Amino acid sequence: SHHWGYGKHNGPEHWHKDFPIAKGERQSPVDIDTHTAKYDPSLKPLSVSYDQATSLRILNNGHAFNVEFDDSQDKAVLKGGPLDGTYRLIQFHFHWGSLDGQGSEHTVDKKKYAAELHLVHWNTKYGDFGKAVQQPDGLAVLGIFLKVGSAKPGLQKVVDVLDSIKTKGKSADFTNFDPRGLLPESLDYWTYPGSLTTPPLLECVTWIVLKEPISVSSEQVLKFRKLNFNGEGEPEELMVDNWRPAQPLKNRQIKASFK
Ligand SMILES: NS(=O)(=O)CCNC(=O)/C(Cc1ccc(O)c(Br)c1)=N/O
Ligand SMILES: NS(=O)(=O)CCNC(=O)/C(Cc1ccc(O)c(Br)c1)=N/O
Ligand SMILES: NS(=O)(=O)CCNC(=O)/C(Cc1ccc(O)c(Br)c1)=N/O
Ligand SMILES: [Zn+2]
């Protein structure tokens, strides 16, 4: 069974032994070199249609916490930009650091943000998530960087439930949460073809990384850092530094939606 994590003994440098696609040709995350990305005037505007989103539950899975959505119909979808067709929101989660100077998975001119939010969507032409992850255009992940500054009010409901899911395997109801409150003002983005950033590291993702970070407060990110990787009644290991570092770009181009 799955024994991957973020520690010295089971972290990103070990993943390749069970998941050899870790050394593949379209791995994520990557550094976004802002002076090598090309503005692509053909990209359409991005369409984030989250008005009918139905959040269900929040779960600590021992790697991060996921907010799960009802993806049984086109309720919260991503379209446009580099995408063909319609991608359904299934879950969001974050990656974060032990300190404010690290935590993001993508970097921008080698800059690491405190955290990174991933909104994971799957291509409806493949009918379910499991089938989608087997296709090179199966997922669209919207990535949003977090910096520490002013509080993000649309994050606070998430921060306030984290005490109820401290350890691995704990879940809680999380209905009526509006993921629109996690977005920045601008939808300017970079895009590139890549992979899941966790095992099984499948090369099925169109990445859409927003240029504008959102600001969260030090108190809000502190609460992320109080979570635990371990299960109840096990030795406490704080859930921090659950990020994969940047991977080789290889033969890929990162495109910008903006000049
Ligand atoms: N290539 S990988 O999937 O990242 C990591 C594979 N390594 C392992 O299974 C182990 C032994 C291990 C044993 C029991 C556990 O409960 C955990 Br956790 C890990 N490393 O010490
Ligand atoms: N950081 S991320 O790129 O957004 C990747 C977030 N990780 C994932 O969704 C998973 C869970 C997963 C669940 C069911 C599956 O069939 C497959 Br495959 C993966 N990795 O195991
Ligand atoms: N050698 S591989 O292709 O990476 C094995 C591929 N495994 C799968 O698609 C899965 C889904 C999965 C879910 C969560 C995980 O954490 C991992 Br890992 C894998 N089996 O459950
Ligand atoms: Zn992620």
Q: Where are the domains of the chain?
A: 1-259
- Which residues are known catalytic residues? 63
Contact between 212 and 64 under an 8 Å Cβ cutoff? The reply is no
Identity of the residue numbered 185:
E
- CA gap 142, 221 in Å, rounded: 20
Answer CATH for 1-259 from 3.30.360.10, 3.10.200.10, 3.30.750.80, 3.40.50.2300? 3.10.200.10
34 labeled binding residue: no
Identity of the residue numbered 253:
Q
Residue closest via CA to ligand 2's atom 12 equals 200
121 labeled binding residue: no
Contact between 3 and 229 under an 8 Å Cβ cutoff? The reply is no
Q: Which residue has the tokens 């053909």?
A: 42
In short, whether 200's Cβ falls inside 6 Å of ligand 3 is yes
Identity of the residue numbered 65:
F
Residue closest via CA to ligand 3's atom 2 equals 200
From the CA of 142, the nearest ligand is 2
The environment of the single-atom ion ligand 4, i.e. residues with CB closer than 5 A, is 118
- CA gap 4, 22 in Å, rounded: 12
In short, whether 9's Cβ falls inside 6 Å of ligand 1 is yes
Resolution of the model in angstroms: 1.6
Rounded to the nearest 5 degrees, what angle is found at the Cα of 132, between the Cα atoms of 15 and 34? Answer: 65
